[model samples]
Target: PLGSPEFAAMDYKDDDDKALENLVVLNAASVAGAHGILSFLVFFCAAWYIKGRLAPGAAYAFYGVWPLLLLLLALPPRAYAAAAS
Candidate 1:
């Protein structure tokens, strides 16, 4: 009785909540991606550029983290889905 399938149905309106949450998560993921770009790379690059310390070839190094960030953008529900384990 404790492990019955009826327990799953008892969740009531959780389905509606989760459906809307997934959409919210979808857009939030994009916002996070852009924020990372601005915070992690843009600010530093602009500062160095204005300070006359930004080397021509070193800009590539600054962007090296983008690939890692790219893969990270695809965390696939790992970021918040069922967020509790």
Candidate 2:
């Protein structure tokens, strides 16, 4: 279902329609990847900031939250897959 509404409304026999659909998917995936990379950096920075501001034991405990950030990074693909359906 990638760009489903727009693609479905168009004439699939037209090559241009397919090209536009591909273009939309490409752009969406590129933005997703770019934001994923940016958030990954920000999450690391946030973790470091927390680590620096607290006691060693307490700060180390913050590491337990790393999986949450990892989950955020992993979610985009699922969203894209859902859109594709």
Candidate 3:
């Protein structure tokens, strides 16, 4: 039993696995947060700059929708992990 596949698989139940999982989640969350902030700022600035060119309602809708679009487009670290695993 000591050299069995079950024993090998139990390696992931140890401290290192917990640490790695935490790091992966934390890094993914950090990247997501940074992307959200950067996208919001860039969109806000561009929208402000072009507010005069666009209709008021259109500009408001753009500001509302652009964040969701950018967040959806940005890749999180967990995405890489999920794909890799």
Candidate 4:
């Protein structure tokens, strides 16, 4: 009388799939935040010490920031659970 795609679905819904799904954003946030701060600090300080600026080539790096946030937002979560939530 019951079936799931021809297979029995699990009895338990388990953890909050929304939270789990949206969790990627938080994970991505910290990882990206870390990457930016750490990597740029190194690069920044180097050029900073030399009094330099990012060339047009560097624009590519910052450009992806928008798409990154957008993609994460497209994921889920956000019942105002956490900051990024």
Candidate with maximal lDDT? 3
Candidate lDDT (C-alpha), each: 0.54, 0.51, 0.55, 0.53
For residues 3-73, what per-residue lDDT tens digits would candidate 4 score against the true structure?
76334344334336656766676667646655665566566546554455654225335533644665456
Model 1's C-alpha root-mean-square deviation from the true structure amounts to 7.9
Model 1 Cα lDDT, one tens digit per residue, 29-55: 556555555564655566666567655
TM-score of 2: 0.36
Which ranges in model 3 have alpha carbons more than 4 Å from their true place? Answer: 1-13, 47-85
TM-score of 1: 0.32
> How displaced is residue 66 in candidate 3, in Å?
19
How far is 83's C-alpha from truth in model 1 (Å)? 26
Per-residue lDDT, model 4, residue 37, is 51
Q: Sort by lDDT, best first.
A: 3, 1, 4, 2
Q: What's the count of clashing pairs in each model shown?
A: 0, 1, 0, 0
Model 3, 1-85: lDDT tens digits are 6689877678757746666665666556556655555565566446665657444445445545554444434444554457563
Q: For model 3, how many clashes?
A: 0
